[PDB]
Amino acid sequence: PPTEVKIVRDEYGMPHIYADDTYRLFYGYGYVVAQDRLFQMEMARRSTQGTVSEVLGKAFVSFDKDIRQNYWPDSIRAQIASLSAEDKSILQGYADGMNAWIDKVNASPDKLLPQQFSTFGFKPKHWEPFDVAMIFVGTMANRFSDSTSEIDNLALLTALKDKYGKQQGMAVFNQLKWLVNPSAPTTIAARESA
Amino acid sequence: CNMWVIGKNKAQDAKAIMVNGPQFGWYAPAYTYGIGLHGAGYDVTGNTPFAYPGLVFGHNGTISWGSTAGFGDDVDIFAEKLSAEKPGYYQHNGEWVKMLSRKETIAVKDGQPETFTVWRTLHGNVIKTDTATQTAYAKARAWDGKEVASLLAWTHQMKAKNWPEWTQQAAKQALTINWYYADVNGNIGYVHTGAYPDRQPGHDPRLPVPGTGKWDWKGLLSFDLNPKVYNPQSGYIANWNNSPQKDYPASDLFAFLWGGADRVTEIDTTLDKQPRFTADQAWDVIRQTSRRDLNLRLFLPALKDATANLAENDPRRQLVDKLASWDGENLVNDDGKTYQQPGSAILNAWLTSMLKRTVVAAVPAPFGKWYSASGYETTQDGPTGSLNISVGAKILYEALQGDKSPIPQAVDLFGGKPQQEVILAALDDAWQTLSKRYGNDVTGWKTPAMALTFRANNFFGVPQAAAKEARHQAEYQNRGTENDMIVFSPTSGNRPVLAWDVVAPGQSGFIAPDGKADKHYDDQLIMYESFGRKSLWLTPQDVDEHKESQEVLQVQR
Ligand SMILES: [Ca+2]
Known about the structure:
The complex is a heterodimer. Chain A is mainly alpha-helical. Chain A has helices spanning about 20-35, 40-50, 55, 60-70, 75-80, 85-105, 110, 115-120, 130-140, 150-160, 165-175, and strands spanning about 5-10, 15-20. Chain A is built from eleven helices and two strands, in the order E-E-H-H-H-H-H-H-H-H-H-H-H. In chain A, strands 1-2 form a two-stranded antiparallel ribbon. Chain B folds into three domains: about 1-70 and about 145-290 and about 450-535, 4-Layer Sandwich (Glutamine Phosphoribosylpyrophosphate, subunit 1, domain 1), CATH 3.60.20.10; about 75-145, Penicillin G acylase, beta-roll domain; about 290-450, Penicillin amidase (Acylase) alpha subunit, N-terminal domain (Orthogonal Bundle). Chain B contains twelve helices and 26 strands. Chain B has helices at about 145-155, 165-170, 265-270, 280-290, 295-305, 315-325, 345-355, 360, 390-400, 420-440, 525-530, 540-545, and strands at about 1-5, 15-20, 30-40, 40-50, 55-60, 65-70, 75-80, 90, 95-100, 100-105, 115-120, 125-130, 135-140, 175-185, 190-195, 195-200, 210, 220, 230, 235-240, 450-455, 470-475, 485-490, 495-500, 535, 545-555. The longest helix of chain B has 20 residues, at about 420-440. The interface between A and B is large, with 136 and 152 residues. Calcium ion (CA) binds near residues 73, 75, 76, 205 and 252 of chain B. Chain B: This is Penicillin G acylase subunit beta. Chain B: It comes from Kluyvera cryocrescens.
């Protein structure tokens, strides 16, 4: 049937998911994920949106600030709003798959709720597509792929110019932080392309 | 992050092999999630960080893919001009333009809420403001607006079935990431993916630029310029976050350099020499690299030269002679706590002294300390990520090559003294510190071993598990957080593809309310350290053969 999602876990607990369209396929993913790494993910959610102190308290305020200072939710919402339904199904499926398990967990806390939630004194809540996009956006984009030290570099340069003078200051800057180094081991041999 | 991909000509008893070691630190529960997807155009296996929709590490039966971090310069900083008579406005193309601003309130459990404003310009979010200079710093990202595009590109590549179809996705991936390809036919490929800015001529991308308009990006460069290679004459593709392509510029990070000294050369060296590699041998590169001292190769020549004319009894010589006796691979003793050889400790001490004497001494405070690190700095609980050649080492190395280096030495890092004099001074210091701890006989030095910790906090430093759940491995290993191998057209196996992975500490992070850990909470931890692996299953048959549990849901919308 086009209404079914099958779930098969191998020897080491690894889920394989079997389904006939995009929404149900990722709904399955969401479901097995909420079983395996609920908590890891709830906390990844909060990390990636700077909503950590909401439950862990005063210690994580600067972190929350830092995160939210470092993106613009509305851009992410606009991007999602501007997807096809086919693409939008991936996210909405995932979020609902997760939400389905959480409903069961908030229906059998005494047998299903991961201990951490009891230990850290809060309960999991429902996921929306924005939340699931941000797991990726707030890690892969906003951590890795978000590297500058251009301000520090300028500080360094001005300190070098002060000692050494202007022309030599820059020459030393080039010696410490070259743009490009001809002798660098490259993953694509020079015979093939520059 | 590392990877080696081995082509038809370089593979043995197979057509292609792809070995992938992404480095993101070590955590518990495991950083990546194991998942198989079957339906709606997808037939895939592997694993992926934070259970993203797209598998960053895996295969679909025909091809396989993977990633290492790119470190291209896809971020710049724009110096916005403001006026004291206009809060929230910046000058751009001769007119005063309004900043976007939102208000955020942070709810604090058992605490008073804090509210503040995020600002945003044309170029990006504001990262700092200097009222004194009337300037605001805005962070422009080439991938801005293409975040979810990139999420989706990761996913759709899983459907591709050849180089053309797959590169079409690669072009839609905007984050600065290295992408790797292998297939059943034994073709191998590489693409240094991402959006990268078309800069104005004269734009130095290591420093800020004015945001008043004339230095705005022209646009983005085309995918055509992104470095890429398909079936290279080398027979392999190897990467350890090193430069993708001759004359390609790296990230503007001061602490990051692609130069003469690069750890990828440790992989190159293993791979050259053996003309062909079976699967087992290709997976065994992990062990070899896991334990390789990265610095021995770079400095031992200078050390030998420097101590040749000393007496055989000079303790400085005893140190260098002992290093020369070493294969540069670290192993732990039976005590589970010290290294069989003392070579890393030696190099660390020497290099620390070496750097203070050269680079750091050439750089004004408080900046010199950016270059003071040897690369070995750790605690009981171990490094938190990969080991690498430090920035300072790399810069020193160029100085030791002298005329052999392409980088003009505007300052003589040796302060007009022979290199030899300094090298010895540093050896003296190392000998001084080490002998005081371990005594005067290098053969009786049991130096400390690096350990490994699976941390209960995620890389943000935010708890993702209880403190107790953190796990200790006796032996630190300069390897992937996970490892996976895909083998193509194995002449032995029936199936067209074989694939293995390892997801330590285990697939599940579930602990019941009564405290009972899942059966798959810890069951790959010992496998990890062992350099072991588990098989990855794709076909419905194989997945049925190794079932353990089965659930069926009726879903709709
Ligand atoms: Ca830059």
